[PDB]
């Protein structure tokens, strides 16, 4: 099955975490916990923003450009990224914006973290409608010493 995992400010705004105006270690731990031991598919700018392969995961980079690191797998299309994952129970797509667009129609599961912030940006997670997605998990948290904003984890399943 294919799943997307993303952190969304209000209005589904997304971005690179190292430039988002928040500190959310709890969400980063949520991400790691839900991606560990699974293939992760990411776009090139997401690759560059991370700066290193994610340990304990097969890293696949979807780009039209030739590869620049043998520690990860470089593919040129959505179908190739999927094929490169081989035979696994769950494929995690980790952005960014265009990658989320491309994979959403093939996905059965969403792991969303909603962040209580208004942040300007021209990139958004694609529209997911209640008609198509059943929310099967939600877990609300408030800001604290480590975490700058209210954040809510949500898992949805395609109806």
């Amino acid at each position, epitope marked *: 099955m294919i799943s997307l995992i993303a952190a*969304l400010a*209000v*209005d*589904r705004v997304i971005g690179m975490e190292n430039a988002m105006p928040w500190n959310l270690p709890a969400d980063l731990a949520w991400f790691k916990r839900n991606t560990l031991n699974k293939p992760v598919i990411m776009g090139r700018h997401t690759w560059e923003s991370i700066g290193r392969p994610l340990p304990g995961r097969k890293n696949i980079i979807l780009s039209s450009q030739p590869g620049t690191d043998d520690r990860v797998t470089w593919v040129k299309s959505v179908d190739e990224a999927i094929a490169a994952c081989g035979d696994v129970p769950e494929i995690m797509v980790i952005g960014g914006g265009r990658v989320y667009e491309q994979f959403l129609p093939k996905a059965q599961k969403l792991y969303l973290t*909603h962040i*209580d*912030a*208004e942040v300007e940006g021209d990139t958004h997670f694609p529209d997911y409608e209640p008609d198509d997605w059943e929310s099967v998990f*939600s877990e*609300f948290h*408030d*800001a604290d010493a480590q975490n700058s*904003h*209210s*954040y*809510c984890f949500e898992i949805l399943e395609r109806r």
Partner: nanobody, 126 residues
Framework: QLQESGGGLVQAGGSLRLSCTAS????????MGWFRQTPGKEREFVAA????????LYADSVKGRFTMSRDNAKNTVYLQMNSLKPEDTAVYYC?????????????????????WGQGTQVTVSS
């Protein structure tokens, strides 16, 4: 499933505090807003706040006089109204966003309501 309270008579220059309490487990995934309507006139946007309470938006007519706040543990939003004046006189209503996790701007500029309060009359003397 919204219920306002507070309101009634206040002297000009005075303060009034409104609250809006909700029933329902999904309250804290929605933006909330305050509106005001006088008989036979337009309903007017007053304030909005995001789902988690951190971010607010106000009409220029109430900016710096009114504050909206939120307490998700109590499923409640509040409107603190200071420096009140006669033309603030109106029925005040709270409304829940019909769409989850939107900005204050989207709540105001792309209307979609899931729920409205019964309204509470606010009356400012002169």
């Amino acid at each position: 499933q919204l219920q306002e309270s507070g309101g009634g008579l206040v002297q000009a220059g005075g303060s009034l505090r409104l609250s809006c309490t909700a029933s329902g487990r999904t309250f804290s995934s929605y933006a909330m807003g305050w509106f005001r309507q006088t008989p036979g006139k337009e309903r007017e946007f007053v304030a909005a706040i995001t789902w988690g309470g951190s971010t607010t938006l106000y009409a220029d007519s109430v900016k710096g006089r009114f504050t909206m706040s939120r307490d998700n543990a109590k499923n409640t939003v509040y409107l603190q109204m200071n420096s009140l004046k006669p033309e603030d006189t109106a029925v005040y209503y709270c409304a829940a966003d019909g769409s989850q996790y939107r900005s204050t701007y989207s709540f105001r500029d792309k209307p979609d309501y899931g729920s409205w309060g019964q309204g509470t009359q606010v009356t400012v003397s002169s």
